[PDB]
Design a protein around this ligand. Structure first.
Ligand SMILES: [Mg+2]
Lengths: 65, 156, 156
């Protein structure tokens, strides 16, 4: 009869466990969100600067200096 | 120092600006203190590939007024607005190298840039990995950071 | 309106972090529904997560903030287990009745009953709780329950 009772309980205890693991990982996730933003933004600046007419003119002139 | 509306505090270095005046004077072919449409034409035609659609008009357009060394310095600074240093960029990458190997698997870093965050498009992806240091299936973020930062070890 | 206005903004924050990681246009894969709610501090069973819109695999469905708020509200009122329940459950498998159990019998219950967990997941909670065996292969399960319930910043 009360076999499902015991079973529901085991189930809720496993749930607590899954909640534990997830909350543990949360802080690494917010730090990483800052990591990625720094990476995508800087590679993007690099790309734009490389396409710049004034930058191109600059490179092909630094040598002669 | 002045405005072309972006820069707040141009603390980009003194060796870095000393070079630029040597560059500017070589570009100012007519010796009068201003870069003309004709100064660019002459100098660029010499070094090789030389723009002449009136994008030469587009180049001079970029500056709100006459082009002296000071407007020059100002427009370049606007371009460097929004950029971090090598230490900051290198530790950003390290946040993903749990085993402190000082490298990342190539499959991993490609997935990070294209399917997450402000994700890259195919043309951004292509231009980013054309130049990148990879061996044994391992991306070297230390070497890549010094590269895009222009570190002068050897680019002679 | 039982949800206070700052609780609403606590939700807006967690939602955006996951929105950022889902390869973003300001939306969230319906599969990560359980994880988002777990970060707000609730412990729902998979069954309940399904009874509100969660999915079995990734890339099947997305959720705008407007559809997320009412699902969360629904899960707040589901049942959550107590210390007294958890001990009754374990005494069920105590041969002598001295509060011990073998690591063996422990693994076995976590991976074959209720909603089974993975050996890697069972490995990682046993690692994090720093739970320890005695010379005859045994463990006291009261200590285990308490450490799980205290959470990961088990602090004090
Ligand atoms: Mg001149």
């Amino acid at each position: 009869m009360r076999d499902e009772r015991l079973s529901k309980i085991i189930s809720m205890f496993q749930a607590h466990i899954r909640g534990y693991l997830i909350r543990k990982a949360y802080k690494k996730l917010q730090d990483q969100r800052i990591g990625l933003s720094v990476i995508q933004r800087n590679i993007r600046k690099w790309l734009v600067l490389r396409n710049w007419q004034w930058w191109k003119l600059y490179s092909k002139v630094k040598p002669l200096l | 120092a002045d405005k072309a509306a972006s820069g707040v505090l141009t603390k980009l270095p003194q060796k870095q600006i000393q070079e630029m005046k040597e560059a500017f004077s070589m570009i100012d072919v007519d010796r009068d203190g201003f870069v003309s449409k004709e100064d660019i034409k002459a100098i660029s035609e010499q070094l090789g590939r030389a723009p002449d659609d009136k994008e030469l008009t587009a180049m001079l357009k970029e500056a709100p007024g006459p082009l002296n060394f000071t407007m020059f310095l100002s427009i370049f600074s606007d371009k460097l607005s929004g950029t971090d240093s090598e230490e900051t960029i290198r530790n950003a990458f390290a946040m993903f190298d749990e085993q402190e190997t000082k490298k990342l698997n190539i499959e991993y870093i490609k997935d990070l840039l294209e399917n997450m965050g402000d994700n890259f498009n195919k043309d951004e992806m292509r231009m980013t990995f054309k130049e990148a240091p990879v061996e044994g299936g391992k991306f070297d973020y230390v070497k890549f950071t010094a590269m895009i930062k222009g570190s002068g070890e050897e680019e002679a | 309106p039982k949800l206070s206005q700052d609780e609403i903004d606590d939700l807006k924050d967690v939602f955006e972090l996951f929105a950022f990681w889902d390869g973003r246009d300001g939306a969230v894969d319906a599969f990560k529904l359980g994880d988002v709610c777990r970060c707000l501090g609730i412990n729902p069973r998979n069954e309940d997560v399904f009874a509100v819109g969660g999915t079995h695999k990734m890339g099947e469905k997305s959720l705008p903030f407007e559809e997320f708020l009412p699902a969360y509200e629904g899960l707040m009122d589901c049942e959550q287990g107590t210390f007294a329940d958890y001990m009754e459950a374990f005494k069920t498998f105590d041969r002598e009745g001295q509060g011990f159990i073998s690591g063996a019998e422990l693994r076995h219950v976590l991976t074959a009953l209720g909603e089974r967990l993975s050996d890697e997941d069972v490995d990682e909670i046993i690692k994090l709780t720093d739970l320890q065996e005695d010379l005859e292969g045994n463990v006291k399960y009261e200590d285990f329950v308490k450490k799980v319930m205290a959470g990961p910043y088990p602090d004090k």
